[PDB]
């Protein structure tokens, strides 16, 4: 019952029923003219001040949540790419917040990088607040995917021709490398934005995952999490499970 654990539990419980959007930021493997662009082919560290700051935040979040009782053998390249994607994902969120003139302190958000059995690396984002309404979900997904595709093409470390960069840009948009949670439906039928409950989803689902500590990553494990209150960022796996237990 450290202050950190109690603090996170209290913060989430107060936001238990806050409606938010659920996004997933991802990428897919691409071959363009014989050039392989994989999940970790985006390792340029762009020297933009805010991005640099965000990447430092991800590094230190990893460092403080590392359990050293147990050894951690995650590939350094994998760690680097996840830190970079953390900075790029948040850059996308913040760019759209700016478009809507939303004060970042009026926003609740949660970010968690995971490794799926099938899709590999992806990043869950929960985001919402007083300036958010359900009908805006599709616009948000489209805008986030514009910025995500733009930043990925800038961060790509594969030598691409201009034609190849534009092709990659359109692939990332056309194939929806940012997804939005919707209610299950038919292909023809409309899809409605499905808002989720912020505190509940974090405590009862995201904080229950197992920490990736090896390469290749455990199926369904998480790398790293963070939130708008810096509450879950530094928690070790055991502490995260304690938060779920206390939340109940």
Chain contacts with Cu ion (rule: CB under 5 A): 114
Shortest approach of Cu ion to residue 87 CB, angstroms? 19
**Residue nearest Cu ion by beta-carbon distance:** 114
Helices (H), the chain: 3-14, 49-65, 76-99, 137-155, 162-174, 198-204, 237-247
Establish whether 173 is an annotated binding residue: no
Shorter beta-carbon distance to Cu ion: residue 156 or 211:
211
Cα–Cα–Cα angle for 20, 110, 172, rounded to 5 degrees: 85
Both tokens of 85, joined, read 């994607």
30 half-sphere exposure, CB direction, 13 A CA radius = 24
Going by the DSSP 8-state scheme, the letter that residue 208 receives in this structure is: G
Q: Could you say which of 147, 205, 222, 247 is catalytic?
A: 205
The CB density around residue 134, as the number of other CB atoms within 10 Å, is: 13
| Separation CA 30–CA 237 (nearest Å) | 33
Establish whether 124 is an annotated binding residue: yes
Establish whether 71 is an annotated binding residue: no
Shorter beta-carbon distance to Cu ion: residue 128 or 217:
217
Shortest approach of Cu ion to residue 29 CB, angstroms? 18
Both tokens of 148, joined, read 């995500």
Active site (annotated) includes residue 205: yes
Cα–Cα–Cα angle for 213, 209, 11, rounded to 5 degrees: 115
Cα–Cα–Cα angle for 154, 105, 2, rounded to 5 degrees: 100
Shortest approach of Cu ion to residue 167 CB, angstroms? 27
Task: Return phi, psi of residue 124, to 5°.
Answer: -80, 135
Shorter beta-carbon distance to Cu ion: residue 4 or 114:
114
Question: Which are the contacts of 225, defined by CB distance < 8 A and separation ≥ 6?
Answer: 61, 65, 110, 111, 112, 113, 206, 207, 232, 233, 235, 240
Shorter beta-carbon distance to Cu ion: residue 95 or 176:
176
Residue whose structure tokens are 């995201």: 206
Shortest approach of Cu ion to residue 116 CB, angstroms? 5
Shortest approach of Cu ion to residue 152 CB, angstroms? 19
| Separation CA 85–CA 41 (nearest Å) | 11
Shorter beta-carbon distance to Cu ion: residue 137 or 217:
217
Catalytic residue ranges: 205
Annotated binding residues for a divalent metal cation: 114, 122, 124
């Amino acid at each position: 019952y450290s202050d950190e654990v109690l603090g996170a539990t209290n913060w989430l419980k107060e936001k238990s029923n806050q409606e938010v959007f659920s996004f997933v930021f991802k990428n897919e493997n691409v071959q363009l003219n014989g050039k392989d662009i994989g999940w970790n082919s985006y390792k340029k560290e762009l020297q933009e001040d805010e991005l640099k700051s965000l990447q430092r935040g991800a590094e230190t979040t990893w460092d403080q949540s590392e359990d050293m009782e147990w050894e951690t053998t995650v590939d350094e390249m994998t760690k680097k790419q996840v830190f970079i994607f953390d900075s790029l994902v948040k850059k996308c969120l913040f760019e759209v917040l700016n478009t809507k003139n939303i004060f970042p302190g009026d926003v609740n958000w949660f970010v968690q990088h995971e490794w799926g059995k099938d899709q590999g690396w992806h990043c869950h984002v929960l985001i919402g607040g007083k300036d958010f309404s359900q009908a805006q979900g599709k616009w948000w997904r489209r805008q986030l995917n514009v910025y995500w595709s733009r930043w990925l093409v800038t961060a790509c470390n594969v030598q691409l021709t201009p034609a190849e960069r534009i092709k990659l840009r359109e692939i990332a948009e056309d194939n929806e490398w940012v997804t939005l949670l919707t209610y299950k439906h038919k292909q023809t039928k409309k899809d409605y934005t499905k808002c989720v409950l912020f505190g509940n989803m974090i405590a009862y689902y995201f904080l229950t995952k197992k920490k990736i500590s090896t390469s290749p990553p455990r199926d369904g494990g998480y790398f790293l999490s963070s939130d708008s209150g810096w509450k879950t960022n530094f928690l070790k796996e055991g502490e995260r499970h304690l938060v779920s237990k206390l939340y109940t």
